[PDB]
Design a protein around this ligand. Sequence first.
Ligand code: AMP
Lengths: 116, 112
Amino acid sequence: ARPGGDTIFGKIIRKEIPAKIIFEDDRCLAFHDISPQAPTHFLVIPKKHISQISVAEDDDESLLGHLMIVGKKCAADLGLNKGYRMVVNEGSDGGQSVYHVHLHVLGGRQMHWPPG
Amino acid sequence: GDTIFGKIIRKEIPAKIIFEDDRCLAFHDISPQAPTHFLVIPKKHISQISVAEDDDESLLGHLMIVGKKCAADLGLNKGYRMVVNEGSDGGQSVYHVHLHVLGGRQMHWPPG
Ligand SMILES: Nc1ncnc2c1ncn2[C@@H]1O[C@H](COP(=O)(O)O)[C@@H](O)[C@H]1O
């Protein structure tokens, strides 16, 4: 059990697969999405492996909130001064493709409603 | 300034409440975009995620944990999408921080 696991995102955490990194600390990593859906589109992920939000534990609250605080700070650092949308996809109906928790941050254009 | 979400927290206008604790409130969205569409909001008036403080971390994480628990209780066993909107480009509709939780249909990509 390599730390962070062997999903795409676990490999990125251990520098085994390349990524365009915006910010890194002891708890999380922010990097650009390889298939962007907006002019700016990045991901914020914990270093701790949690497969999906539906299985997060109560004591994971601080870490999940940290993803949002880092996401909003990275958005400011990238000049997203008109705003942005944060997204978590859970399971099949959420469209989830990578089973390591992650927060999308999208901006640099007008986002539409409904959010998919 | 006050918002309609402040009025909902204070019980001044009605909403279909799903869950409440000492620090947040979850309730069905009045303009639902999926068969299940609810909001989880802090009782603290944070106007937008861009002005949240570092010491709000665990409160924000609490919104997500409450959101995922309410989703399971509402029977969203095939999954769901969580969304926080910021500002004009994000489509933020009320200037009181709120986590959307949507499910009961396939959610699509891009997410708006
Ligand atoms: N190697 C990679 N580097 C950066 N982003 C990725 C990589 N592989 C997948 N993604 C993105 O990860 C997200 C996974 O889908 P989802 O689980 O629905 O959020 C998608 O937006 C992908 O484009």
